[PDB]
């Protein structure tokens, strides 16, 4: 339960073994997500980490690492 709780969220939301959730992977190009999945995924991160992710930030969160990045930088 490191801040890489991020990894568990992405895997649960996209139905992907925690093994394929690598730091370099993009949701769409690598993990099979579409844009409805990525709306839900961003909301899942908002709810798991008690943080509000506005649109101009959400649109930058396209890879596993980017999600890690944002959560560590917002407590």
């Amino acid at each position: 339960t490191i801040e890489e709780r991020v990894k568990k969220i992405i895997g649960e939301q996209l139905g992907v073994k925690q093994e394929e959730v690598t730091n370099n992977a993009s949701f769409v190009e690598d993990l099979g997500a579409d844009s409805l999945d990525t709306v839900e995924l961003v909301m899942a991160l908002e709810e798991e980490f008690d943080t509000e992710i506005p649109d101009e930030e959400a649109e930058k969160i396209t890879t596993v690492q980017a999600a890690i990045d944002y959560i560590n930088g917002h407590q």
Binding site: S35, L36, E40, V42, M43
Partner: protein, 83 residues
Amino acid sequence: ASSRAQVLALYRAMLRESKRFSAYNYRTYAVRRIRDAFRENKNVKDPVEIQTLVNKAKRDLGVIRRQVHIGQLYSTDKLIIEN
């Protein structure tokens, strides 16, 4: 005005507002229905039919906003399973 931008913005707005339902039964139904309906209609191609679905979603967003607020004014205890 972009159907895709309208659609993804409505999707996020509708999910966020529905999560504010105080009643378990309305909240869990609305989030699920929104998620199923946008997915069901993902492959519609006719611009006019898309616009019809977009206008219905905007009308339903108004319903959700009002019903959430009314449900907050007259809220009650949680269900046994929310414990």
